[PDB]
């Protein structure tokens, strides 16, 4: 390509058919290249055979995410502001049931807008702003309206840094191809200087402006816009102005104190969102580390070190090419970023970190399943992109004889095991349930697997739960309750509208879901593991790195020779994970409502959204639609003519879109060709078709329009199924 | 000032405790593991004299030497030494 | 053509050398000490107060810093050069009268040659020391320990 250059046009390329592999989009017309162009639009086997740029693009086309997450948030802060309900909800929590969005009464619309709290028509929320927002050491609607434009500021600017890259004549190699410092910085002072900084604006301002909110008032009968400077006088109620101490150290006297923190654990009676008196200390006690920690270092050295006998000789030298990969140092990350998201999903529901959550049921489970699909949707990826490594990234083979060349050495092996693992599971991990049916429908309970028939006896208790809620008696200092109230030992009194967390008991019907997870988590990974491992060569095809990591299927021979590849192992690996997460969700809420969520009154006689129906009745896998799907969902199929209605009214579409995927999943290809011409014929008679040769779907595009649909179908189905059984009773 | 002035000098009791016990512990480095109580390099009693740890970790007690009694159960007896 | 803006190791430093030079006499408070008897404070807490102040008020504050910023970028264009600035007046041969030239310092030239007896007995130092005058009032705005005060003393 010209047009023409090198050097010697500014005149930009708008006009002249094509670009992207060289007997390119050819003069001669076609359609396939219009899904080409969008797909693989980002890729790197083309653009140039030379690293250089690519990192100079990804550090820019990156940017436009932050900026975006930044245009987003703004319409959420704005939204969570003038489309109010926040002002109204906060003087009045336990009571309200929040909104931010509202229609405009065009056509049918309005049904969707149904009285939500501080006196107005709207559609609800299961996205816990209104609750980060508890923070506001200040309060005010127009104020969020500054935090809002403060958002659009970071954006335009944190979006003109993206002009101020690639398009501007760019940095180069050394800049990233000296890695030497990167984490040094990152973790030290941002990971640090945020958490740190967050400390300073987490007791300064917030703690006090909810220390005396957890009582009454109406805001501006509290927390001015400046009030919190030098005036270290209201900081007087929430500890000393250090009195006689000077910059910690010890020649200090406490005859009666010990700074803010004074460590909690449990839950505010009046706002059980976990205590804040702590929340500063923990973030402070973070940062320090990061503050000390981001001070390594300059790199091989540490990895060029510990080897052994069978261990990893190539451990030593574990990648020069880890300054020369991406597709590698992205895949690693996704496993972590991803696997480090759904660890949120627990510490959240068994330890709320915001005021008013749990009581708020629906506004932190939405969460625990949204955060849950990322700690999964980012993991199969975290494999895909390793397959993208394993196939291609490096120039030649300069990488040699090491940890990997090792793992591969065995490979019909690491995956030889893992397999049997799964059929051991599955048999012990699902037909287990099927016993029950076949023998409870035969009907002889003597011999089921009930929490009571097969020998276990009115106790689960003695394991580690019961040595967690009881541990404030070790090296442990203490502080009433535990760490997470859901643990075996002691305490009850949690909240005065509805409930929050309490013990959460186990045994079987907790024993075996917990095991289906195993088998589910395991056969997921089998297919990804073997998939990324056998990326490039095999004894079904060895001539098998020769195009890319996709390729439809090699060809009718060898018997099958179809699925193979690794786009496709990252195609049938999604297919499982949709279950992996989709059944983990199914788990939590049936627990968390069967027990936990429920409610106090006199003598606090607890009354769960369901008197533990779980008991003897999830163990039957029909009980999973006797007690679940057919029981709850009665709220989705009753939901017409209401306010939420948009869920029942989705629940048919998307419970349709899924049942459209199979068409894309289950079908041939020269088929819709053979068909597309009958069409093309009738077209030509009137004189109406040929130009831009209309073509069927690109074997693997077809699979691309399976899967993606099967998910946005099979998923939102419950996104509806859910929001419709926590809004309204529960 | 205040007692925090006798504590202004106590910046020394940590920072000089730290940094004066600094250089030696990183000085003949490029070393990693190892010392005398292991693999070949050799002589005993065990001993005796080799710094940072010994002297300054003893100085935290030392800061409580002369300010002792004066801060404690305030003043007693008729000159504990007997001399004028 | 399109306007220019050359970055190169260290423009950011020539104009960053300059920014502080202007701020070194926009230091103001102790450079011209008669400036504030109490004017450093824009307008205590107690503070001082035994507003902030009487005042010289007002509005027409943006229009200034904008409109005379609509000059900063003119002694930055005009004297790109091709000179004709002295448009003089169409007629009249009587306009020898000059004024200076291009000025930096005691003016047209230096001038009145003839000098030294008594006054008696580069130039980043004429910079360096006045951030050591700038950043100094910087903390002196918040220059307090308040609950306590000078430990020193
Ligand atoms: C006003 C400016 C402007 C102009 C005229 C250009 C022009 C160009 N850029 Mg570019 N760029 C810009 C701003 C601009 N850029 C900014 C602000 C960034 C960083 C944010 C970049 C980052 C960038 C990179 C990495 C690259 C270019 C490249 C190019 C060249 C190819 C452009 C193209 O066809 O992409 C078409 C794409 C668009 C017009 C849209 C850009 C996508 C982002 C910024 C916004 C869209 C996201 C949006 C939310 C859509 C998703 C939601 C959807 C449902 C609506 C071309 C000369 C490429 C090059 O050098 O040749 C190989 C190179 O790849 N640019
Ligand atoms: C940190 C990571 C992130 C980044 C930066 C990338 C980057 C990349 N990936 Mg990737 N990937 C990721 C996470 C990431 N991935 C994860 C988590 C997975 C697992 C699902 C994958 C699975 C994956 C595959 C299989 C492939 C890539 C490929 C690529 C490359 C092609 C990108 C492209 O052209 O856009 C592609 C995006 C589109 C064409 C847009 C279509 C999006 C559709 C499906 C919409 C999604 C549904 C949504 C609900 C619809 C919107 C709403 C609607 C109803 C209105 C690029 C380098 C491709 C490659 O060939 O490598 C060179 C290869 O195809 N990725
Ligand atoms: C995951 C599931 C699984 C398991 C573990 C069981 C287990 C059981 N079923 Mg059962 N069942 C299942 C799926 C399963 N079922 C399914 C899917 C169905 C429908 C297809 C049924 C339909 C069914 C019926 C109708 C009945 C049972 C019954 C039983 C019980 C009698 C078993 C027996 O006598 O075998 C004999 C046992 C052996 C020969 C033991 C040896 C096998 C073990 C030891 C293999 C271990 C490997 C070894 C330890 C590895 C170590 C290596 C070594 C070197 C150390 C037993 C509890 C019966 C019952 O009444 O239960 C109450 C009843 O007959 N099942
Ligand atoms: C084209 C075909 C024909 C038709 C009309 C259907 C229709 C349906 N099938 Mg189906 N099916 C077919 C052939 C067909 N099938 C074949 C050949 C098979 C294989 C044998 C199947 C196998 C199958 C299965 C397994 C299932 C279905 C199901 C369904 C139903 C989903 C419920 C629903 O849509 O409520 C109708 C109400 C609406 C669609 C309201 C829509 C309002 C919303 C979406 C907003 C308005 C639209 C707007 C554009 C969307 C927003 C998008 C925006 C971003 C642009 C639907 C009635 C599913 C079911 O529900 O029970 C069986 C089930 O999953 N089918
Ligand atoms: C979160 C998402 C997001 C972001 C940040 C980007 C960012 C980018 N995309 Mg992109 N893209 C996305 C989603 C996104 N895309 C999706 C969903 C698709 C559908 C498959 C594409 C399909 C696509 C193509 C075909 C191309 C890009 C390109 C680009 C780059 C060009 C920027 C430019 O030229 O001027 C910025 C221009 C403006 C801001 C003008 C305003 C335009 C509207 C949309 C606003 C930029 C890195 C171009 C590229 O190769 O660069 C890497 C290429 O042309 N994208
Ligand atoms: C993350 C979000 C994103 C999304 C999905 C939305 C979605 C919406 N915004 Mg919105 N908005 C956003 C970012 C977003 N906004 C940002 C960054 C800003 C600041 C510029 C705004 C400022 C804004 C205003 C002023 C309005 C909306 C309104 C709306 C609603 C009207 C629909 C529409 O835009 O077209 C049609 C819709 C629910 C409208 C509304 O709430 O009335 C019902 C109202 O017009 N938005
Ligand atoms: C990095 C953090 C963040 C930031 C930007 C600030 C900033 C400030 N704090 Mg501060 N503070 C923080 C975290 C932070 N704090 C935390 C976590 C605690 C508790 C451990 C405190 C406990 C605290 C007290 C007791 C006071 C301040 C004061 C101040 C102000 C001047 C003194 C000072 O600390 O620095 C500047 C350094 C000097 C002036 C020397 C200044 C606005 C003081 C104040 O009100 O103004 C004088 C004083 O009251 N802070
Ligand atoms: C489920 C698993 C696993 C996990 C995630 C934890 C997590 C925890 N245990 Mg623990 N524990 C476990 C298995 C686990 N334990 C087992 C198997 C035993 C005995 C068989 C114990 C016996 C034990 C004791 C005695 C204590 C804990 C404590 C703790 C907590 C203190 C954090 C800490 O010291 O390390 C920090 C780690 C990171 C920051 C990462 C933390 C919640 C302590 C506690 O919570 O008491 C108040 C207490 O000291 N554990
Ligand atoms: C018939 C129709 C439609 C349907 C539809 C259906 C029947 C369905 C659909 C669906 C869709 C969807 C569904 C989309 C979407 C979405 C979304 C937005 C999602 C989201 C989410 C997330 C966030 C993730 C996951 C979950 C969820 C899903 C929730 C229409 C038709 C027509 C006609 C007549 C002609 C003309 C055109 C029209 C007018 C158009
Ligand atoms: C749900 C199945 C039962 C199996 C577990 C039962 C074992 C423990 C007994 C009940 C557990 C619930 O704990 C609950 O006890 C009492 C209910 O009578 C309530 O008792 C509460 O009400 C009264 C008001 O002053 C007083 O008697 C108590 O001081 C107070 O704690 C509490 O709200 C709660 O602590
Ligand atoms: C149904 C099906 C098809 C047929 C599907 C097709 C042809 C979908 C493509 C239809 C396009 C998206 C219609 C585009 C036309 C409009 C975009 C043009 C008008 C513009 C708008 C204004 C309407 C395949 O090609 C296929 C291939 C491989 C495996 C399975 C399948 C499969 O299951």
Swiss-Prot record, chain A:
UniProt protein name: Photosystem I P700 chlorophyll a apoprotein A1
PROSITE patterns reported in the protein's UniProt record: PHOTOSYSTEM_I_PSAAB (PS00419)
MF terms in GO: 4 iron, 4 sulfur cluster binding; chlorophyll binding; electron transfer activity; magnesium ion binding; oxidoreductase activity
Binding site for chlorophyll a': 655
Disulphide-bonded residues: none
Signal peptide as annotated in the record: none
Catalyzed chemical reaction(s): reduced [plastocyanin] + hnu + oxidized [2Fe-2S]-[ferredoxin] = oxidized [plastocyanin] + reduced [2Fe-2S]-[ferredoxin]
Broad class of where this protein is predominantly found: plastid
GO biological process: photosynthesis
Cofactor note: P700 is a chlorophyll a/chlorophyll a' dimer, A0 is one or more chlorophyll a, A1 is one or both phylloquinones and FX is a shared 4Fe-4S iron-sulfur center.
Cellular compartment(s): Plastid, Chloroplast thylakoid membrane
UniProt similarity note: Belongs to the PsaA/PsaB family.
Amino-acid positions noted as binding [4Fe-4S] cluster in the UniProt annotation, renumbered to this chain: 553, 562
Residues annotated as binding chlorophyll a: 663, 671
Pfam family, any one: PsaA_PsaB
Physiological role: PsaA and PsaB bind P700, the primary electron donor of photosystem I (PSI), as well as the electron acceptors A0, A1 and FX. PSI is a plastocyanin-ferredoxin oxidoreductase, converting photonic excitation into a charge separation, which transfers an electron from the donor P700 chlorophyll pair to the spectroscopically characterized acceptors A0, A1, FX, FA and FB in turn. Oxidized P700 is reduced on the lumenal side of the thylakoid membrane by plastocyanin.
Lineage: Eukaryota, Viridiplantae, Streptophyta, Embryophyta, Tracheophyta
Entry keywords, A to Z: 4Fe-4S, Chlorophyll, Chloroplast, Chromophore, Electron transport, Iron, Iron-sulfur, Magnesium, Membrane, Metal-binding, Oxidoreductase, Photosynthesis, Photosystem I, Plastid, Thylakoid, Transmembrane, Transmembrane helix, Transport
GO cellular component annotations of the record: chloroplast thylakoid membrane; photosystem I
Protein origin, superkingdom: Eukaryota
Top-rank EC class of the record's enzyme: oxidoreductase
UniProtKB/Swiss-Prot annotation, chain B:
Keywords carried by this UniProt record: Chloroplast, Membrane, Photosynthesis, Photosystem I, Plastid, Thylakoid, Transit peptide, Transmembrane, Transmembrane helix
TM segment ranges: 7-27, 53-78
Membrane topology: Multi-pass membrane protein
Compartments where found: Plastid, Chloroplast thylakoid membrane
One GO term (biological process): photosynthesis
GO cellular component terms given for this protein: chloroplast thylakoid membrane; photosystem I
Family from the record: Belongs to the PsaG/PsaK family.
Protein name: Photosystem I reaction center subunit psaK, chloroplastic
């Amino acid at each position: 390509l010209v047009d023409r250059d090198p050097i010697k046009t500014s005149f930009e390329q708008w006009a002249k058919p094509g670009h992207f592999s060289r007997t390119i989009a050819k003069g001669p017309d076609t359609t396939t290249w219009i899904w080409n162009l969008h797909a693989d639009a980002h890729d790197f086997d083309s653009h140039t055979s030379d690293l250089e740029e690519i990192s100079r693009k990804v550090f820019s086309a990156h940017f436009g995410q932050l900026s975006i997450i930044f245009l987003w948030l703004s319409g959420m802060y704005f939204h969570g502001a003038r489309f109010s309900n926040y002002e109204a909800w906060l003087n009045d929590p336990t009571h309200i049931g929040p909104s931010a969005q509202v229609v405009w009464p065009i056509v049918g619309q309005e049904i969707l807008n149904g009285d939500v709290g501080g006196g107005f028509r709207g559609i609800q929320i299961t996205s816990g702003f209104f609750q980060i927002w508890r923070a506001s050491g200040i309060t005010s609607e127009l104020q969020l309206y500054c935090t809002a434009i403060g958002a659009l500021v970071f954006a335009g600017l944190m979006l003109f840094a993206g002009w101020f890259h690639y398009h501007k004549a760019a940095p180069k190699l050394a800049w990233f191809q000296d890695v030497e410092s990167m984490l040094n910085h990152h973790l030290a002072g941002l990971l640090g200087l945020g958490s740190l900084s967050w400390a300073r604006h987490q007791v300064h301002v917030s703690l006090p402006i909810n220390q005396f909110l957890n009582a009454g008032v109406d805001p501006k009968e509290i927390p001015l816009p400046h009030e919190f400077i030098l005036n270290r006088d209201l900081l007087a109620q929430l500890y000393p102005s250090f009195a006689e101490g000077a910059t910690p150290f010890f020649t200090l006297n406490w005859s009666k104190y010990a700074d803010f923190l004074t460590f909690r654990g449990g839950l505010d009676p009046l706002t059980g969102g976990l205590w804040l008196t702590d929340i500063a200390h923990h973030h402070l006690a973070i940062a320090i580390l990061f503050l000390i920690a981001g001070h390594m270092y300059r790199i091989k050295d540490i990895l060029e070190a510990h080897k052994g006998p069978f261990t990893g000789q190539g451990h030593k030298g574990l990648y020069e090419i880890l300054t020369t990969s991406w597709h590698a140092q992205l895949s690693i990350n996704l496993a972590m970023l991803g696997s480090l998201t759904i660890v949120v999903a627990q510490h959240m529901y068994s330890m709320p970190p915001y005021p008013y959550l749990a009581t708020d049921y629906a506004t932190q489970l939405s969460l625990f399943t949204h955060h849950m699909w990322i700690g999964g949707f980012l993991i199969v990826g975290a494999a895909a992109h390793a397959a993208i490594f394993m196939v291609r990234d490096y120039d030649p083979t300069t990488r040699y004889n090491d940890l990997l060349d090792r793992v591969l050495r065995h490979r019909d092996a690491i995956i030889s095991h893992l397999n049997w693992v799964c059929i051991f599971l599955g048999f012990h991990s699902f037909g287990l349930y099927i016993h029950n049916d076949t023998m409870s429908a035969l009907g002889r309970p003597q011999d089921m697997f009930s929490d009571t028939a097969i020998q276990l006896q009115p106790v689960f208790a003695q394991w580690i739960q019961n040595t967690h809620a009881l541990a404030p008696g070790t090296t442990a200092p203490g502080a009433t309750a535990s760490t997470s109230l859901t643990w075996g030992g002691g305490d009850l009194v949690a909240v005065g509208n509805k409930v929050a967390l309490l013990p959460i008991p186990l045994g079987t019907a907790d024993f075996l879901v917990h095991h289906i997870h195993a088998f589910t988590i395991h056969v997921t990974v089998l297919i990804l593991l073997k998939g990324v491992l056998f990326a490039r060569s095999s004894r079904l095809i060895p001539d098998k790195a020769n195009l890319g990591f996709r390729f439809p299927c090699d060809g009718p021979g060898r018997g099958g020779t179809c699925q193979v590849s690794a786009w496709d192992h990252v195609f049938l690996g999604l297919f499982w994970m949709y279950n992996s997460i989709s059944v983990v969700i199914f788990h939590f809420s049936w627990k968390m409502q069967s027990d936990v969520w429920g409610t106090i009154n006199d003598q606090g006689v607890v009354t769960h959204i369901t008197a533990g129906n779980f008991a003897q009745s999830s163990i039957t896998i029909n009980g999973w639609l006797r007690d679940f799907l057919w029981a709850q969902a009665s709220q989705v199929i009753q939901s017409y003519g209401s306010s939420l209605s948009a869920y029942g009214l989705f629940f048919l579409g998307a419970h349709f879109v899924w049942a459209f995927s199979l068409m894309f999943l289950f079908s041939g290809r020269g088929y819709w060709q053979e068909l597309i011409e009958s069409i093309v014929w009738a077209h030509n008679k009137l004189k109406v078709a040929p130009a831009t040769q209309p073509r069927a779907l690109s074997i693997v595009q077809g699979r691309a329009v399976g899967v993606t649909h099967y998910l946005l179908g099979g998923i939102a189905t419950t996104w509806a199924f859910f929001l419709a059984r926590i809004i309204a009773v529960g | 000032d205040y007692i925090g002035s006798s504590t202004n000098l106590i910046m020394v009791t940590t920072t000089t405790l730290m940094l004066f016990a600094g250089r030696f512990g990183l000085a003949p480095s490029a070393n990693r593991k190892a010392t005398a109580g292991l693999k070949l390099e050799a002589r005993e009693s065990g001993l005796q004299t080799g710094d940072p740890a010994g002297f300054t970790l003893a100085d935290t007690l030392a800061c409580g030497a002369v300010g002792h009694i004066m801060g404690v159960g305030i003043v007693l007896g008729l000159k504990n030494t007997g001399v004028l | 053509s399109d306007p220019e803006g050359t970055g190169g190791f260290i423009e950011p430093k020539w104009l960053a050398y300059g920014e502080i030079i202007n701020g070194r006499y926009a230091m103001l408070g102790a450079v011209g000490a008669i400036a504030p008897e109490i004017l450093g404070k824009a307008g205590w807490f107690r503070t001082g107060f035994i507003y902030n102040y009487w005042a010289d008020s007002y509005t027409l504050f943006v229009f200034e810093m904008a409109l005379m910023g609509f000059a900063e970028h003119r002694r930055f264009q005009d004297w790109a050069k091709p000179g004709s600035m002295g448009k003089q007046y169409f007629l009249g041969l009587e306009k020898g009268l000059g004024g200076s030239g291009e000025p930096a310092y005691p003016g047209g030239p230096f001038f009145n040659p003839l000098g030294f007896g008594k006054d008696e007995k580069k130039l980043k130092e004429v910079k360096n020391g006045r951030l050591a005058m700038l950043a100094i009032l910087g903390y002196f705005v918040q220059a307090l320990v308040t609950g306590v005060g000078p430990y020193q003393n």
